[PDB]
A paper describes a structure:
Our results supported a “two-arm” architecture of the [name] complex, with the PP2Aa/c-bound STRNs acting as an organizing center to hold Hippo or other MST kinases with STRIP1 as one arm and [name]-SLMAP as the other. Moreover, we determined the crystal structures of the second coiled-coil domain of [name] alone, and in complex with an STRN3 peptide, as well as the structure of the first coiled-coil domain of [name] in complex with the first coiled-coil domain of SLMAP. [name] functions to bridge SLMAP through CC1 on one hand and STRN3 through CC2 on the other. In particular, we discovered [name] as a key adaptor that recruits MST-bound SLMAP to PP2A-bound STRN, forming a molecular arm MST-SLMAP-[name]-STRN-PP2Aa/c.
In the structure of the STRN3-[name] CC2 complex, two [name] CC2 molecules (chains A and B) formed a homodimer to bind one STRN3 peptide, resulting in a 2:1 heterotrimer. STRN3 folded as an alpha helix with a C-terminal turn. Many residues mediating homotetramerization of [name] CC2 in the apo state were now found to contact the STRN3 peptide. For example, residues H97, A100, L103, I104, and K107 in chain B, and L101, M105, and Y108 in chain A of [name] CC2 formed a hydrophobic patch with residues L179, Y182, L183, V186, and Y188 of STRN3. In addition, the side chains of residues E96 in chain B and R109 in chain A of [name] CC2 formed two salt bridges and three hydrogen bonds with R176 and E185 of STRN3. Structural comparison revealed significant conformational changes in [name] CC2 upon STRN3 binding. Secondly, in the presence of STRN3, [name] CC2 became an asymmetric homodimer (chains A and B) with C-terminal regions in both chains bending closer to each other (about 22°). The bended chain B occupied a position corresponding to chain A′ of [name] CC2 in the apo state. Since the STRN3 bound to [name] as if it were a helical chain of [name], the bending of [name] CC2 thus blocked the binding of another STRN3 peptide, explaining the 2:1 stoichiometry. Structure-guided mutational analysis showed that mutations of STRN3 (R176A/E185A and L179D/V186D) or [name] (E96A/R109A and A100D/M105E) on the [name]-STRN3 interface disrupted the complex formation.
Residue numbers in the entry:
A (entry chain C): 172 to 190
B (entry chain B): 73 to 119
C (entry chain A): 68 to 119
Write the structure that this text describes.
């Protein structure tokens, strides 16, 4: 389903964004 | 009522879901492009 | 209905299928763009850590 969010979050964390 | 009405309702729900996912993908792409640009600036400062 | 593809119910279905298809294509285009930019980001990061 919409598990594509985990990939987006991986990318965002790789470039330095945080939770 | 009928199954065509059920198929329409299912397609409308899927449409709403897809618009939400596209918003998330567009936002992520904008955030990553911003970091990539700022990294290029820092590579310009270092070089 | 006897109107086939052009019946009111079938055009509603067809329009939703077409728009959902366009959204799915745009999602794939966004994922293609994201993995391409991430590839460049990692390369540039190596150059950055090499110089600085």
């Amino acid at each position: 389903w919409k598990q594509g969010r985990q990939l987006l979050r991986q990318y965002l964390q790789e470039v330095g964004y945080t939770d | 009522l009928s199954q065509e009405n059920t198929q329409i309702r299912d397609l409308q729900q899927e449409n709403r879901e897809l618009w939400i996912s596209l918003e998330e993908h567009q936002d992520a792409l904008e955030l990553i492009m911003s970091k990539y640009r700022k990294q290029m600036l820092q590579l310009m400062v270092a070089k």
